[PDB]
């Protein structure tokens, strides 16, 4: 186990195949199928778990802890509780429905099981840009006092090609270890999902993000302990397929005029 | 391309930048539907920032040639970029007599043709339309087998299609 | 069978490392050569063993070794476009004698195109300039494209047929590169012929205030005019502009200096339409003693497209009308059929001269 | 050997000798950009109340010849191609098309308007007809387009760009499917509001032989909906089913479904497992305000 | 994001914008005409001047010809606070 | 024994000795790529899907005529040399080409139109089935026929029965697919339609029901007025600028051809024009017997009585009543359709399916 030592490569697990054998995908973009080290175990890892690999042979080394560094949120809140929720008035009608779909399921999860109502996993906020959102998410995150992840919608794309789909996965993996986690996406209307016709043939950047956004929602969150909040502008900037049941059923519009 | 054009223009000071058909790039880009913006003005912003930026000091100058002034960006005309706006209308009467004589220096004639007479037979013709008359005058002598271009070659060329003259049939009644 | 002979010489051309060269375009020439790869990587190199110092030019693809970069063999530039390779045809079926009529639409084209190519020293005595471009529009249905192929047969050189919709690509700005693809072969291949078809979809100013998506097409001509007559008068071959709508074109494109000879097709008269049936009389089946001048006289003025339809449909009456060959009676039935019967609507001829 | 290997099969490739090692898995069911393939949905006839009158019509037209192909063959007639319905907005017809593939063991496949025009070399126009061919590969299933329609959310309420183009195209492509096995059984179910939006060529016979009008839900129609669609959970039977239906004015199948979501939202504030008529009264007044707004 | 890296380092800094009609565009979906990186660049101004990053020590001076071409959401308060009229 | 030793023995010996060299050549991972251009010096340039740039020579197992820009070749791993050309198998790329598995729709079902049926057969099926008639005559065969008439006259089934007996390649294209959303892809599609169809067999290009570029009402795929001139004139150049030996036939049909640009027709290529009208009482008796041939009818149903009740009906309206009468008997599960089903069928067709035209005169 200690032959590997310092020169290690960061890998990612994909799917189990054979006993003590698994497929891995490193940050270099080249996927390899190697054998699992005897000191490791298939039950001690996760399908999305990141692992270590050798420099040349790229053999499996060790299972990293369920903490993904990546970028953006990294660890967690830093100096966030600078304000309270009383600084924004008139939204008490709108903020009441937000606390029920965000703060309520993160406290008592048996209220939805006994009553038998499926709490919305995703949250979209409509309305003209520059009215709501903004300080609202900060007020909810400060009153909850739990894990909070704010990832900008335009930051998912990286200069490297295959880094796009891996940065999206690392955001949801941070919500796996910490149950009271809130994932916020600022300006989700940039990449959106497929963005109507994205001309995928000429640009692959969308297909890598398109597959992950649909897979991460259905693949995770079954425990209903993690909620997703996205910040958009209007409905014409998003794919209406998101409103289909099974992924995101929630619709919130700003009370304009 | 334009950004590096002024970068190399700073190395050699006595340089002159020429732009052909300025109407190719310009617009305010409005009265449309959503996307389709900046399909033009991406390059125009280079001419805005560079000419008003560190460039255009002493010997750095840009001469922008275009077709018509009806369609362009009024923001392009400024005392910091294009100063002199000069109209170049059609040639005058006696001016066309000197133009026709210059294009004939490579031809062969008897020098018996009055050039002031051919200029008076031409009313408001383009400069290229003047040189095009000498082209047809040479083709007429080839069909008739003449060893030199005579007076009737330029006269028959006007009757043919050159400038504002088109006839597919005699049609006299 | 041919693979056995090539395996003998394949020892030096395979085992050894020669061909595995990385091709890239050279940028700066210091007489150190700065060359940028296809992966966007810049490096410095120099000449080779058999490489000549005068062969390397600015803006040329130069293959270099992948391990230790060095100049080995030069390559012709502009290797990216694959589109213009299929635009060149060979041996068109339409001959020079296929164009009927004694009128002036024949002799005027051969003197400004075929004459300087066959006898370049004829006009050199007078010291004149042969017309670079020509003008052929005419009404739809006169077989204008047939006259363009008749010139390529007598020329016996490279012919290029360009579709007006081919210049417009699926990206904005790619059409500008499509223009230089045509003029690059003019300097590479001398004494060739280029032909544009349906330029109305391209030309015209169309200004600004319209739908707003029209600014992409108007830049194709501004790229085409620049490549034709620019700051540097670079040109060799003849350029042919053709379309069915001369009125919708650019009023600058309709003025000389890019074009000198201007020929517009017209409908043949009683003497003209007679030769249309004479060139078709050698074909099909013509009964002895039939005068074709009476058939073209009963037919009104119409384009050559409807004139050739008389001889084609005349053979169709040999089945239903119970006839052996085409007789005079079947010709009179074609007058009320090929002409009078097919008028109705959707018949162009002279209908649309403008828009 | 090569007999056990076919296309779209993920295998292993050795790094040293560069040869075949083993077989990993096959290709996933979803393909291209967006692929919706669902077999045996959860929508049934007992889960949709009040439409039984319209269920018997689509059962003897769509469902009947699919399960018994020997009927129309003995009668000498041909199976109708398309079926389209129209009515007020907020239709519950989505569950009707899902219930057809349930009993017929077919699949439920939707075509997205963005799947028609994409970026490909030579396949750009194929993607319009690709999902028509892809639906033929696995099962007859159902061709159902709900994607492009005017409920008021999108502009140009008179027509659409990607609506009449794909709907009219797939009707004329059945000539190849006509006469070939497991093909002609494929039908097309459409949806719309007004008949003036469609082209006059669609109103002519030979393409859509049956046009069923969808009436708006009435008081008696919402009675069976309130006891099925409105209750997904454990509730009290003390409330009146016909009294709540009278309080809802102009509520379609979509507005009544929203009552189920808001039925317990007012109970979440007090955190109680008992849901009385106090919450249902506040749910009806909340839905009616969103309908009258704008 | 490379520009705002110096904002947190040197506090007395001001970002000049000279004749910029571009990055404040609109362009939602016509098919996007391959704007994929530009649409994110438009959103970059909707993040640094919006989210929890420290502000107030770095002033944004933006200059444009016609504000109607720019995104109306960018002109609203919360990003550009002061509109200076230069008649 | 003697003959096999001087023929099969020397040939099989050279084949076994040759394949021993194929291991060092056709072995290895065998990367592929796209051919760029060739040269008389036997060299080419190939770009793999990883987008490299390589310039190598031309090896065996390939011909100079087989090399074309835009094709697929086979490279080498170590030496990176072209092994040979790889032809595209499993159909010519796009499979929606309507290869016509031939359901065999005969002329007996379209019967009653025989006055206008023999019109298209002589200008389409006759030169394909009996080419010696036009070749020995000397006239050039027409490239197709244009169809015009009211909906329901059987213009769709007329061209379907022609391609059945010819046993050749035939295409069916919807007129609404000529225009796409992206600008410039409209004329690019029309180039690939006639290119692939002309390479394999004397095919026929049939585009039915052309609404292209009129009454737009299209928000998504509308390209303005520039898509109008590029897409339409691209089809005109395929019948003019595109050279062909006469094996490509183009037949266009729709409800109204007046909205289309008449310059696109160019009737020097198409010398045949077929119109359509409503059938009389004598023709409807033959059409009614076609649909009722396989249908089981009762003894109280008269064929001449149903035709007499028909007023201002087309060929599609006759089948509509035969289909509606079959659905009524299907609900009650009756083998022989009674007379009561035809009474309720004619009332539903004349009400909804049959709408009064806007002609209105008289």
From Swiss-Prot, chain A:
Disulfide bonds: none
PTMs per UniProt: N-acetylated by NAT3.
GO terms, molecular function: ATP binding; ATP hydrolysis activity; identical protein binding; proteasome-activating activity
Transmembrane segments: none
Entry GO terms, CC: cytoplasm; nucleus; proteasome complex; proteasome regulatory particle, base subcomplex
Primary location: cytoplasm
Positions with a binding annotation for ATP: 127-134
GO annotation, biological process: positive regulation of RNA polymerase II transcription preinitiation complex assembly; proteasome regulatory particle assembly; proteasome-mediated ubiquitin-dependent protein catabolic process; ubiquitin-dependent protein catabolic process
Assigned keywords, A-Z: Acetylation, ATP-binding, Cytoplasm, Isopeptide bond, Nucleotide-binding, Nucleus, Proteasome, Ubl conjugation
Cross-link (Glycyl lysine isopeptide (Lys-Gly) (interchain with G-Cter in ubiquitin)): 194
Subcellular location: Cytoplasm; Nucleus
Tree of life domain: Eukaryota
Function: The 26S proteasome is involved in the ATP-dependent degradation of ubiquitinated proteins. The regulatory (or ATPase) complex confers ATP dependency and substrate specificity to the 26S complex.
Family classification: Belongs to the AAA ATPase family.
Protein name as annotated: 26S proteasome regulatory subunit 6B homolog
Organism: Saccharomyces cerevisiae (strain ATCC 204508 / S288c) (Baker's yeast)
Lineage: Eukaryota, Fungi, Dikarya, Ascomycota, Saccharomycotina
Full-sequence portion shown in this chain: 87 to 343 of 428
From Swiss-Prot, chain B:
Signal peptide start-end: none
Compartment(s) of residence: Cytoplasm; Nucleus
Processing after translation: N-acetylated by NAT1.
Assigned protein family: Belongs to the AAA ATPase family.
Function: The 26S proteasome is involved in the ATP-dependent degradation of ubiquitinated proteins. The regulatory (or ATPase) complex confers ATP dependency and substrate specificity to the 26S complex.
Name by which UniProt lists this protein: 26S proteasome regulatory subunit 6A
Organism encoding this protein: Saccharomyces cerevisiae (strain ATCC 204508 / S288c)
Source organism phylogeny: Eukaryota, Fungi, Dikarya, Ascomycota, Saccharomycotina
Gene: RPT5
Residues of the full protein shown: 262 to 434 of 434
From Swiss-Prot, chain D:
GO biological process: chromatin remodeling; nonfunctional rRNA decay; nucleotide-excision repair; positive regulation of RNA polymerase II transcription preinitiation complex assembly; positive regulation of transcription elongation by RNA polymerase II; proteasome regulatory particle assembly; proteasome-mediated ubiquitin-dependent protein catabolic process
Transmembrane segments: none
GO molecular-function term, one example from the UniProt record: ubiquitin protein ligase binding
One term under GO cellular component: nucleus
Places the protein is found: Cytoplasm; Nucleus
Modifications the protein undergoes after translation, according to the UniProt entry: N-acetylated by NAT1.
Domain of life: Eukaryota
Chain sites annotated for binding ATP: 87-94
Main location, first listed in the record: cytoplasm
Keywords: Acetylation, ATP-binding, Cytoplasm, Nucleotide-binding, Nucleus, Proteasome
Assembly behavior: May form a homodimer or a heterodimer with a related family member. Interacts with OLA1, TMA17, and UBR1.
Family listed: Belongs to the AAA ATPase family.
Function according to Swiss-Prot or TrEMBL: The 26S proteasome is involved in the ATP-dependent degradation of ubiquitinated proteins. The regulatory (or ATPase) complex confers ATP dependency and substrate specificity to the 26S complex.
Extra facts: Present with 4700 molecules/cell in log phase SD medium.
Name assigned to this protein: 26S proteasome regulatory subunit 8 homolog
Organism: Saccharomyces cerevisiae (strain ATCC 204508 / S288c) (Baker's yeast)
Interval of the full protein contained in this chain: 103 to 396 of 405
Swiss-Prot record, chain F:
A single cellular component GO annotation: proteasome regulatory particle, base subcomplex
Subcellular location: Cytoplasm; Nucleus
Covalent link location (Glycyl lysine isopeptide (Lys-Gly) (interchain with G-Cter in ubiquitin)): 160, 181, 216
GO biological process: nonfunctional rRNA decay; peptide catabolic process; positive regulation of protein catabolic process; proteasome regulatory particle assembly; proteasome-mediated ubiquitin-dependent protein catabolic process; protein-containing complex localization; ubiquitin-dependent protein catabolic process
Species per Swiss-Prot/TrEMBL record: Saccharomyces cerevisiae (strain ATCC 204508 / S288c)
Phylogenetic classification of the source organism: Eukaryota, Fungi, Dikarya, Ascomycota, Saccharomycotina
Binding positions for ATP per the UniProt entry: 149-156
UniProtKB keywords: ATP-binding, Cytoplasm, Isopeptide bond, Lipoprotein, Myristate, Nucleotide-binding, Nucleus, Proteasome, Ubl conjugation
Family named by the database record: Belongs to the AAA ATPase family.
Phenotype upon changing residue 155 to Q: 73% loss of ATPase activity
Its job: The 26S proteasome is involved in the ATP-dependent degradation of ubiquitinated proteins. The regulatory (or ATPase) complex confers ATP dependency and substrate specificity to the 26S complex. Has ATPase activity.
This protein's encoding gene: RPT2
GO molecular-function terms, A-Z: ATP binding; ATP hydrolysis activity; proteasome-activating activity
Name of the featured protein: 26S proteasome regulatory subunit 4 homolog
